[PDB]
Design a protein around this nucleic acid. Structure first.
Lengths: 90, 91
DNA sequence: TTCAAGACCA
DNA sequence: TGGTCTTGAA
């Protein structure tokens, strides 16, 4: 489990013996599509979306900052669920 | 912050909305499987490329006894020469 | 269709 | 920050 870029290995392809090989970088496109992509369920609205860590902030650790009441549809409901029904999972 | 875990409570920021109460779920199994434990391997001798899980990888040095013995397949001998003498070929 | 809070972009 | 657009509720 786990390899770094530039590790020397033997690699088994179907039909071939274990073969001398090197670990290279994956295609940038391939990594950008999943590296730091978490799925996010949203309380109140129950929608989800995919997000990177810039756009995520821990709750508890910032409920005075971002927990102030808000008029957008489902927000109050979201502040209730996260504190009262956090495992909605619906 | 980085490396969040499944079930972490967060505020989440989308375009046009305030910082929003959220939970981190699992990604879709398909999406995960498409890049989880998948390395881009380059093969010495042939210089072909593939994508492999750790199942199909064995470190060199640790196993040049087992797997490093002479073989008649196209490019294997060269391959054993390159991994020792020119491991940077990258061509 | 008014207005005010707040969300964007330059 | 300033200026404008949008949301939600009179």
């Amino acid at each position: 489990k786990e390899y770094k870029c530039g590790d020397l290995v033997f690699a088994k392809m179907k039909g071939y013996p274990h073969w001398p090989a090197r670990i290279d970088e994956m295609p940038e496109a391939a990594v950008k599509s999943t590296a730091n992509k978490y799925q996010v369920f949203f309380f109140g609205t129950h929608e989800t979306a995919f997000l990177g860590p810039k756009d995520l902030f821990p709750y508890e650790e910032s409920k005075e900052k971002f927990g102030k009441p808000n008029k957008r549809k489902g927000f109050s409901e979201g502040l209730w669920e996260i504190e009262n029904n956090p495992t909605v999972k619906a």
